[PDB]
Design a protein around this nucleic acid. Structure first.
Length: 91
DNA sequence: CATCGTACTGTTACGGCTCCATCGATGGAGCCGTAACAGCGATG
């Protein structure tokens, strides 16, 4: 779980070393937070409107899972929006 | 939450400078007391 960059690099190193298997963050847009071993990312309450749920933010979060050869992105939402439709079409 | 702005203020260690408190003895000479040394006449 992530609550500055000083702790960010330590958390990234711990995740790479296998000390932690999963990571949870309130704002998943900090620079350098991507990892090459991540193969699955989930979006929770994506249907709720918010800045972090915009089309550009969704594309940015989806692009983090492209590092893995078999990386995939899953979504947990019962509703769709125009921004979601555009993001899925582009992907 | 990251980014930006024409050499910043106040309080402590450490080395160098300066002022202030606090702290009988030995040899020479004179004197006294004691020990030591020198220094008529009559007869056979």
């Amino acid at each position: 779980y992530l609550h500055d960059t000083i702790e960010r690099m330590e958390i990234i190193r711990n995740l790479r070393l296998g000390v932690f298997d999963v990571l949870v963050g309130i704002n998943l847009l900090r620079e350098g937070l991507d990892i090459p071993e991540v193969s699955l990312v989930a979006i929770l309450d994506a249907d709720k409107e918010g800045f972090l749920r915009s089309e550009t933010s969704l594309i940015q979060t989806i692009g983090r899972a492209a590092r893995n050869v078999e990386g995939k992105v899953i979504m947990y939402a019962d509703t769709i929006t125009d921004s979601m439709r555009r993001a899925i079409d582009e992907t």
